Amino acid sequence: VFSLGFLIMGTICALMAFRKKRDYLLRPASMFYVFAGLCLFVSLEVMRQSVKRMIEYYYSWSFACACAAFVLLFLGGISLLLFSLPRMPQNPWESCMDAE
Amino acid sequence: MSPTEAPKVRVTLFCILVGIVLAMTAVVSDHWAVLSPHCEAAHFGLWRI
Amino acid sequence: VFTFSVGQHNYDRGPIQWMACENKGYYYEIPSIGAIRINTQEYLDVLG
Amino acid sequence: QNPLRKACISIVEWKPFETIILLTIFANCVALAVYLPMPEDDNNSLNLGLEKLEYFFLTVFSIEAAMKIIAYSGWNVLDFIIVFLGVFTAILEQVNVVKALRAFRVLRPLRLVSGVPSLQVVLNSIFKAMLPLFHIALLVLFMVIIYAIIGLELFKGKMHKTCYYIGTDIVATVENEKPSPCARTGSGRPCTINGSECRGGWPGPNHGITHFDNFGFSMLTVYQCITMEGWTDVLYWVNDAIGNEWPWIYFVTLILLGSFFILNLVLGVLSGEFTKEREKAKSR
Amino acid sequence: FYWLVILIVALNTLSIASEHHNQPLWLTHLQDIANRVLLSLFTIEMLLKMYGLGLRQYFMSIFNRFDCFVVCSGILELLLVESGAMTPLGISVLRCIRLLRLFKITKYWTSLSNLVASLLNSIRSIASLLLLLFLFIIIFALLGMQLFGGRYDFEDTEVRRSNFDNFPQALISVFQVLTGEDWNSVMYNGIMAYGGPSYPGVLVCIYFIILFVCGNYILLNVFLAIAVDNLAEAESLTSAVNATWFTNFILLFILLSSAALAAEDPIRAESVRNQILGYFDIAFTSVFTVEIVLKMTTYGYFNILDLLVVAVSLISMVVKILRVLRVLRPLRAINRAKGLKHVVQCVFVAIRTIGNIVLVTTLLQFMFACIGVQLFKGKFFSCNDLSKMTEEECRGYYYVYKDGDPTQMELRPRQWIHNDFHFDNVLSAMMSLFTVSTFEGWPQLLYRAIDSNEEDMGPVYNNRVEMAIFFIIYIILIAFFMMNIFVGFVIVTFQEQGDKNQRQCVQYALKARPLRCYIPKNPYQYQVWYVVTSSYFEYLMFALIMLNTICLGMQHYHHISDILNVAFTIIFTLEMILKLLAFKARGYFGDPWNVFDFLIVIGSIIDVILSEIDTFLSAFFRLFRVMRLIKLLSRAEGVRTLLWTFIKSFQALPYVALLIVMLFFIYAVIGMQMFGKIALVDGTQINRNNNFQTFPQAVLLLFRCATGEAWQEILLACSYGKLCDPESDYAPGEEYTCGTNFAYYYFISFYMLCAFLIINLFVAVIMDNFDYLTRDWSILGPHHLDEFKAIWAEYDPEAKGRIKHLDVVTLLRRIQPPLG
Numbered sequence A: 001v002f003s004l005g006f007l008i009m010g011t012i013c014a015l016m017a018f019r020k021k022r023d024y025l026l027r028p029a030s031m032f033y034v035f036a037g038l039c040l041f042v043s044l045e046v047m048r049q050s051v052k053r054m055i056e057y058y059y060s061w062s063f064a065c066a067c068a069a070f071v072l073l074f075l076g077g078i079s080l081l082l083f084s085l086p087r088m089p090q091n092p093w094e095s096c097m098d099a100e
Numbered sequence B: 001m002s003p004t005e006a007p008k009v010r011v012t013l014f015c016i017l018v019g020i021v022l023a024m025t026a027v028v029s030d031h032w033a034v035l036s037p038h039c040e041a042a043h044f045g046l047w048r049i
Numbered sequence C: 001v002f003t004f005s006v007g008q009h010n011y012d013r014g015p016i017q018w019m020a021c022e023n024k025g026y027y028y029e030i031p032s033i034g035a036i037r038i039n040t041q042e043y044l045d046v047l048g
Numbered sequence D: 001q002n003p004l005r006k007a008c009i010s011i012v013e014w015k016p017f018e019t020i021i022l023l024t025i026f027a028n029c030v031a032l033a034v035y036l037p038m039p040e041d042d043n044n045s046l047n048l049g050l051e052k053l054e055y056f057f058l059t060v061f062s063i064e065a066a067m068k069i070i071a072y073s074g075w076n077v078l079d080f081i082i083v084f085l086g087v088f089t090a091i092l093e094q095v096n097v098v099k100a101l102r103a104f105r106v107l108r109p110l111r112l113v114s115g116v117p118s119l120q121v122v123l124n125s126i127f128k129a130m131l132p133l134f135h136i137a138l139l140v141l142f143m144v145i146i147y148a149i150i151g152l153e154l155f156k157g158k159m160h161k162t163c164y165y166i167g168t169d170i171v172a173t174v175e176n177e178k179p180s181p182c183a184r185t186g187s188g189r190p191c192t193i194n195g196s197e198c199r200g201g202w203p204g205p206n207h208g209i210t211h212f213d214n215f216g217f218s219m220l221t222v223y224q225c226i227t228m229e230g231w232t233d234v235l236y237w238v239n240d241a242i243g244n245e246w247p248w249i250y251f252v253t254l255i256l257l258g259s260f261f262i263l264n265l266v267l268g269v270l271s272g273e274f275t276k277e278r279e280k281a282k283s284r
Numbered sequence E: 001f002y003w004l005v006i007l008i009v010a011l012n013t014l015s016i017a018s019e020h021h022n023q024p025l026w027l028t029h030l031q032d033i034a035n036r037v038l039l040s041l042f043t044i045e046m047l048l049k050m051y052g053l054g055l056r057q058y059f060m061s062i063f064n065r066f067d068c069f070v071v072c073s074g075i076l077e078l079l080l081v082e083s084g085a086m087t088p089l090g091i092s093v094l095r096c097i098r099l100l101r102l103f104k105i106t107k108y109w110t111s112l113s114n115l116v117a118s119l120l121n122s123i124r125s126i127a128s129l130l131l132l133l134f135l136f137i138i139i140f141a142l143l144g145m146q147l148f149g150g151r152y153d154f155e156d157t158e159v160r161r162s163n164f165d166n167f168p169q170a171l172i173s174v175f176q177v178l179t180g181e182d183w184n185s186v187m188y189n190g191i192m193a194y195g196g197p198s199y200p201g202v203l204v205c206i207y208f209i210i211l212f213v214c215g216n217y218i219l220l221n222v223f224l225a226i227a228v229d230n231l232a233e234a235e236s237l238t239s240a241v242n243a244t245w246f247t248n249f250i251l252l253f254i255l256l257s258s259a260a261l262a263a264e265d266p267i268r269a270e271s272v273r274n275q276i277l278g279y280f281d282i283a284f285t286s287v288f289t290v291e292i293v294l295k296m297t298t299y300g301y302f303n304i305l306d307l308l309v310v311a312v313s314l315i316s317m318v319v320k321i322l323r324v325l326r327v328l329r330p331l332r333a334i335n336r337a338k339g340l341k342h343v344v345q346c347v348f349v350a351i352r353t354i355g356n357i358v359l360v361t362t363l364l365q366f367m368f369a370c371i372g373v374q375l376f377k378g379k380f381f382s383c384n385d386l387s388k389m390t391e392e393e394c395r396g397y398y399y400v401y402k403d404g405d406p407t408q409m410e411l412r413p414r415q416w417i418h419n420d421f422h423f424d425n426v427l428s429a430m431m432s433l434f435t436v437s438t439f440e441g442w443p444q445l446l447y448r449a450i451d452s453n454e455e456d457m458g459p460v461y462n463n464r465v466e467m468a469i470f471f472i473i474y475i476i477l478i479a480f481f482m483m484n485i486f487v488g489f490v491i492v493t494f495q496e497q498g499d500k501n502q503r504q505c506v507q508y509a510l511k512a513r514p515l516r517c518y519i520p521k522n523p524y525q526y527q528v529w530y531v532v533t534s535s536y537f538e539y540l541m542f543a544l545i546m547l548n549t550i551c552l553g554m555q556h557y558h559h560i561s562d563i564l565n566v567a568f569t570i571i572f573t574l575e576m577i578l579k580l581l582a583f584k585a586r587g588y589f590g591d592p593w594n595v596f597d598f599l600i601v602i603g604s605i606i607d608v609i610l611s612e613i614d615t616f617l618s619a620f621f622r623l624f625r626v627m628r629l630i631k632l633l634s635r636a637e638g639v640r641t642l643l644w645t646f647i648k649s650f651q652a653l654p655y656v657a658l659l660i661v662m663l664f665f666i667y668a669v670i671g672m673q674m675f676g677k678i679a680l681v682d683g684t685q686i687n688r689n690n691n692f693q694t695f696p697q698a699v700l701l702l703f704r705c706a707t708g709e710a711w712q713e714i715l716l717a718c719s720y721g722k723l724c725d726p727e728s729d730y731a732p733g734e735e736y737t738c739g740t741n742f743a744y745y746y747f748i749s750f751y752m753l754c755a756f757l758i759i760n761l762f763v764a765v766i767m768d769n770f771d772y773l774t775r776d777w778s779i780l781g782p783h784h785l786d787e788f789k790a791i792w793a794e795y796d797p798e799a800k801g802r803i804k805h806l807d808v809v810t811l812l813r814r815i816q817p818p819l820g
């Protein structure tokens, strides 16, 4: 439910970033997604330990589902953060927080 | 409008959307682990087994 | 006099050899464990 | 400054008094080289004979210091420190009737640098060439600290379990395998020796030296890994302790940033320093 | 005579190189008989040109000066041979004098004699700093004798050759620590000599830390200096379908084919994964065969590679060698990518340029190999137990004692064992010297050669310490002096291709841009903006980060740390709240450092709640509090500038590292195919932590070999005669048939290639920073105008182009005399 709340918060941030020239709001939102996906990782970890306390176990349908969800959330959040960040200066004049 | 109207951020946002949808489906789908001690088909989930 | 030089070392071995075959004795070298048993029983050859 | 009441020996300084002192220091270095360190308070005839010869060097150095101190710093402070430490050790070691003060006798070869101006200018250039490396030194220190803290949080108390023989306290290994950590009912490794059981109480892999148990040991092992001398051993031990999947990320990256990146930085800075020094000297 | 002399010196070189251990008697007769004939030819060629050009001017060149010494030494040696010459070691060394004749080859190339004129001057000028290095080594050897001399008296049977018992051994140990090979073992021995891993016993490691770092720095320094100085005189004296969619489609499919080639099962002949990969391979081949018909119809050196790859893929549905030729799939991308082709052309030009130093290095390695053959031929044999000194003695069984306990013994058969790296012939000697030059396992060869007793007898402990000289000079000459001129060669080579200060100034002036500052209105938030922007606040929070770092390092194996964690998390959350309120969340997220702070604060918060809910009733979330001091980079100007200016250079050459990635991929796939079925055995170099069984494992093995671990032991563990994997498919009766001698070609090449490309990557990245690295910070620099931009932004909260003139008048008072 913590990760669901993070997903919700990232959703409102992303939706609000598209209006009134609020491009900057795309920066925090990605993190939420990342963190949400990140939580899912440790979430399945807990399931793993349950599997390690109770014979043969198999992962068939929803394990790949959760793994793909976590991978998509993490990678998309990182890519969104990198894209929203302006640039590496690469020039002596160029720097972060410049005039557009 | 460079990092908003660009397609490379819109495809990323679509990936985020499909990811959140698939994560929500994963929570409901409590069928990611079958335990057979070896008639006892067991499904494991985070909310309800 | 039977003299034994034991172990791996850089010290001079001449004086103990002189002690050995000056006083009608013998000189032995024991560099490792596996050389102990054979070298602690050859003094009976001299005594015979 | 003061009148000629004591400075009547300033003339002999201009004499080739430096060549005989250089030969004396060379003889002292030779005497230091031929000394044979013996275990557990043992000695031979030569070592006893060198403990008396060092009195000859000490008195010569002291009289040189006395002649130069009354006739009249720079490089001469090191000479005074060396002679004072030597005299202090000599007078202290003969009133107890520890030996750590003798370790100060190895600074005497530095006096050769005081005797050759070319060595002085070379050492001055070397000292001046290390100032631009301050930022790289700070970066290396901070990266070592960060990686040491990460390893302290990740692998603390993990490499303390190995498999001995059942019922004994003898570590179970094979022909050419150094003792390695172990894990029972975990992600680590089980050992395949027949009569072996895995348990704790093991000091550590390298006789209890290589582990992330506290900050000092973690810092030491991180520094050892940065030199790329035995970092794979630490990686393999962590793999045997906690599992194979994750730990490489900690180590490979440490090699990529702590070793290759830092070496590139220092090589670039040194090359720039040499190039600009050559360019500056070309204009003259 | 220009060709006659080269013919006779080539014949002499062949005769010298033909000598090996256990050679046939007729070979020995041919060797000593041919010595007289070639010596006579040398003599007659001496007296011919002596009359041809006169006695006086024959000595004007040093090239013909040492020919006199060569002939005189040959005559003297021949005269001495027929006498009562005992001491076969003396015979070996007089024979070694003869080897000098090989110098004749070095006198038959103009470029082999032109370069010495400047290196002679450089060595004679830097002999002072070489002597300083020698004095440093002597001082640290004396210090090690004081600290560790006579303290290795351990009650075990382990052998510790690298000790400080006397001056030569301490000198050898200090040299070994300087080379960095197995220095940690010496440090462990020193620590155990004292109490152990306790408070007073560990401080001895400081010695080694001083010995290594300060030892290498000056070392690097001197040799680096030599290189550049000499290479300076090396440049001053010498100078005096066609759509992009289809191309991207093909590139993506090539990448996927390479990925499918990587992920595979080299052990199981027919696994569950293999046939899916085969279906993917045939699907890719069907896609790739329609790309060539679409080009052949519309057109007539690079397309032939694609055709060959498709042909070898299709014709495969010793023959298994064809399965190795399909590793050329990534190379096709070289045609598709223009930057990859450019960097490939550049690296080929680089190898073509470097042809005057590899030749001399290889020749010197060959000469040292011949000397080593003369010295250690037949002297690297041994027995299982050191008490047996002859092959006929080393028969039967003997006892080994576990942990050196006489009551715990086990029977082992004793066998005559030959060292894996020896000097029996020139090829094995060259292999051993190549292993030495990489500083991998060279102390083992050093202590094997010191104990060398006779031509067919076992070792004698510390028999010949003077042989260490042979192993030191070779390291000083080849592994130090000529491996640094090679690095200095490329540095000046790319220096050549690398007023202009005014050009930089004007281009930066006309290409700059103002930066926002976000000074807020509404004094209610202006107060908090002022209090959070003042240097007092940043100093306080820096001190708090330092205190947090100190608290993080106080934890140890076997709480109060929980309260401090929560307190620091709360205080940094309050930081974030205050910053958000001051900057109205608009200028807060515009700063990347505030972005990092937000990420770290959120991560720390989540870690705190996770710990609390664990206690009220995952390990990498504790890494968020560690990253906090990374934000200290926002205060260190010099460190941040250096990091940025090197990260920019690394990002500016994504194709130079792509060559390294492609080399790693190709060699990993080849190693999987070749050394894939070797069983994982503890105590060997192929085990659970080091093998070629999967792509990640092979890449890790290659990375380990790159950094200079025991890669020669991995090479020896992959040669022919190893036990095959039980799960692999092989005919019964042949279990010890896995591995191949191709490992010798596999590793030796890779190292060199991995040693080359990395150096390339190191130099290009340096070149992009040449303006910053070679910068005069006094006359002018971009930092002055950067701080001027800072003042402008302070007086111009918004960019808005330019502002009132009286504003610029005030800035002029803030402009320093360096700028104005």
Ligand SMILES: CCCCc1oc2ccccc2c1C(=O)c1cc(I)c(OCCN(CC)CC)c(I)c1
Residues within 6 Å of the ligand: E351, E358, E361, E362, E437, E438, E439, E479, E480, E483, E484, E486, E487, E708, E752, E753, E755, E756
């Ligand atoms: C196609 C192969 C090109 C690269 C190459 O060929 C050589 C032939 C002979 C000797 C060296 C090379 C060589 C190198 O690029 C090379 C190899 C080594 I090993 C090497 O030394 C590595 C650093 N150190 C080892 C720890 C010793 C100085 C250096 I610098 C360059």
Ligand SMILES: [Ca+2]
Residues within 6 Å of the ligand: D228, D229, D230, E180, E181, E182, E439, E440, E708, E709, E710
């Ligand atoms: Ca090494």
